[PDB]
Each structure stands twice: as C-alpha cells, then as structure tokens.
Amino acid sequence: SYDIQAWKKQCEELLNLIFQCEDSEPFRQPVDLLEYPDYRDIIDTPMDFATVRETLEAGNYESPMELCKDVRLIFSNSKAYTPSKRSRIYSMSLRLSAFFEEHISSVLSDYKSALRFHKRN
Length: 121
Ligand SMILES: O=C(CCNC(=O)N1CCCN(C(=O)c2cccc(Cl)c2)CC1)N1CCc2sccc2C1
Prior knowledge:
Interacts with IRS1 and IRS2. Interacts (via bromo domain) with acetylated lysine residues on histone H1.4, histone H3 and H4 (in vitro). This is PH-interacting protein. The protein is mostly helical. It has one domain (about 1-120). Helix content is about 65%, strand content about 0%. It is built from 5 helices and no strands. Helix 1 runs antiparallel to helix 5 and helix 4 packs antiparallel against helix 5. It is elongated and about 55 Å long. Ligand ZL8 binds near residues 36, 39, 81, 83 and 88. The ligand O=C(CCNC(=O)N1CCCN(C(=O)c2cccc(Cl)c2)CC1)N1CCc2sccc2C1 binds near residues 82 and 84.
C-alpha cells in the first residue's frame, strides 16, 4: 500500500472516532482560561482536537508525524496541568492516548513505507 497521500483521510477518520469517544470531551476545544486563569503560567503551547482537525482540513500538515506531534501535545499538556495523577480529566487523557496510539501506528508505518518506496531508485 504505497499511497503517499492516504494518511490524510485515515487521520480524518481517526479524529471522527476521537470526537465520538466520551473521553475526548475535555480536549475538543481550547482549555477554558476563565475556569483555569493560571493555565498559561504552566502551559506554553495550548492544543486541542478542533485545532488539529482545522490544521488538517486547511492543508497545513505535510505528514502524519506532524499531526501526531500536536495530538501528543494535547496529552502532555493535560499531564503537566493536572494537580494529581488521579484527577478525572487526566484519567480521561490516558485512556484517549492509548486509543489514539493503537490507531495511529498503522497510519505512520504505511506513510513511512510509501515514502521509502517513492525513493527506492
Ligand atoms: O478534580 C480534582 C483536581 C483539582 N482541580 C484542578 O486543579 N483542576 C480541575 C479542572 C480541570 N483542569 C483543567 O484546567 C483542564 C485540563 C485539561 C483539559 C481541560 Cl478541558 C481542563 C485541571 C485543574 N481533584 C480535587 C478534589 C479531589 S477529592 C479526590 C480526588 C480529587 C482530585
């Protein structure tokens, strides 16, 4: 399967599944600064799933590795902001991360294989 472009629709599909997951609800839009006025004293680069989907749809990802970096930032921000490893929002982030990683692995492998095939000669 050597289609260099196939990752984009595969990532759209996976974002749709993430938006159906109840565990994504805290991460679908930017963290609420009124509720969390100290957020930007901890978190240098906010990220959320609506921003990832918009970046993808705008044609502003060149590879699925770039999308994966932004999704992993959603999860590292949650871990950095949590007051406890037992907190609800952080606990939802860990389940959603496991789901994401289980599904993105084939997207990344297929893309990287397609690029190697493109450069074979
Ligand atoms: O629930 C908490 C945690 C304390 N409260 C907090 O510091 N936060 C709660 C609000 C969410 N939050 C965000 O800013 C955030 C981060 C990512 C995404 C989004 Cl959407 C929002 C983090 C800040 N516990 C105290 C009471 C008890 S008693 C037994 C266990 C506990 C644990």
